[PDB]
Amino acid sequence: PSCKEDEYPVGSECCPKCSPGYRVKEACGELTGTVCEPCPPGTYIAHLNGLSKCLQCQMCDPAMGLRASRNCSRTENAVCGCSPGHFCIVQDHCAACRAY
Amino acid sequence: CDVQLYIKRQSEHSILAGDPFELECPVKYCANRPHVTWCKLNGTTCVKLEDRQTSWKEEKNISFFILHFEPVLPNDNGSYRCSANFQSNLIESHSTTLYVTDVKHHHHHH
Numbered sequence: 001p002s003c004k005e006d007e008y009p010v011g012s013e014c015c016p017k018c019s020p021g022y023r024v025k026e027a028c029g030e031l032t033g034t035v036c037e038p039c040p041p042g043t044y045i046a047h048l049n050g051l052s053k054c055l056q057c058q059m060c061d062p063a064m065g066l067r068a069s070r071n072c073s074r075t076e077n078a079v080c081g082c083s084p085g086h087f088c089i090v091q092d093h094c095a096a097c098r099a100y
Numbered sequence: 101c102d103v104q105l106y107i108k109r110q111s112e113h114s115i116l117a118g119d120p121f122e123l124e125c126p127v128k129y130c131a132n133r134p135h136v137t138w139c140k141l142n143g144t145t146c147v148k149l150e151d152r153q154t155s156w157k158e159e160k161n162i163s164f165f166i167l168h169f170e171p172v173l174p175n176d177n178g179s180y181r182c183s184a185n186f187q188s189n190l191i192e193s194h195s196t197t198l199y200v201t202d203v204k205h206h207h208h209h210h
C-alpha cells in the first residue's frame with residue numbers, strides 16, 4: 001500500500017514501476033527487479049507505470065477533417081488537430097473539424 | 101539463463117560526504133552482457149547519470165555494474181536504480197537509498 005512516487009502495489013509489498021513506453025511482463029520479488037516489455041504497435045504509456053497492458057493510441061480520422069499534430073509513439077499519445085483550412089467544432093481536445 | 105538485477109527491497113546505505121563510495125548493482129547473465137545504466141530518482145522520473153560515472157566488476161557467476169562516488173557530495177542524498185536492456189526487454193531494480201551526512205556542517209559537542 002505505502003508505495004513511493006516511483007513504486008506500485010503488487011501483493012502486500014511495493015515494486016519498481018516500468019519506464020514510459022514499457023508494460024509490466026513479470027513482477028518483482030524481495031530480491032529481484034521488475035521485468036518490463038515494450039508497448040506493442042499502436043499502444044503507448046506516457047509515465048512510470050505498473051500496467052500489464054499499454055493504453056490505446058488516439059486515432060485522427062481524416063474523414064472528420066483531422067490531421068495528427070503529433071504521432072503516437074510508445075512514450076507519447078497521438079494528438080489530433082485540424083487539417084489545412086479547417087476549424088474545430090467538437091471538444092478535452094478536438095474530435096472533428098469543418099472546412100472553410 | 102534468465103537476466104535479473106539483485107538489489108534487495110529497501111536497500112539503504114549511510115555514508116559520509118567527503119569519503120569515497122561505490123554502489124554495486126548485481127547483474128546476472130550468461131550469454132551477452134546487457135547494457136546497464138544507473139539513474140537517480142527525483143520523484144516521477146529516474147534521471148540517468150553521466151559525469152562522475154560507472155564501471156564493471158565481473159565475478160564467477162554474477163557481475164556488478166558499479167556507480168562510483170569519488171568523493172560523495174552532500175547532494176548525493178536520494179534513491180538510485182539500475183536498469184538493464186536485454187533483448188528489447190527492460191529490468192527495473194529495487195532502488196537503493198543513500199543517506200549522506202554533511203560532515204562539514206555536522207558537529208560533535210561532547
Ligand SMILES: *[C@@H]1O[C@H](CO)[C@@H](O[C@@H]2O[C@H](CO)[C@@H](O)[C@H](O)[C@H]2NC(C)=O)[C@H](O)[C@H]1NC(C)=O
Pocket residue numbers: 068069070071
Ligand atoms: C507523423 O508521421 C507521419 C507518417 O510517418 C508523417 O507523415 C509523413 O510525412 C513525411 C514528411 O516528413 C512524408 O515522407 C510522408 O509521406 C508522410 N506520410 C503520410 C502518410 O502522411 C507526419 O508528418 C508525422 N507528423 C508529425 C508532426 O510527427
Ligand code: NI
Pocket residue numbers: 206208
Ligand atoms: Ni556524528
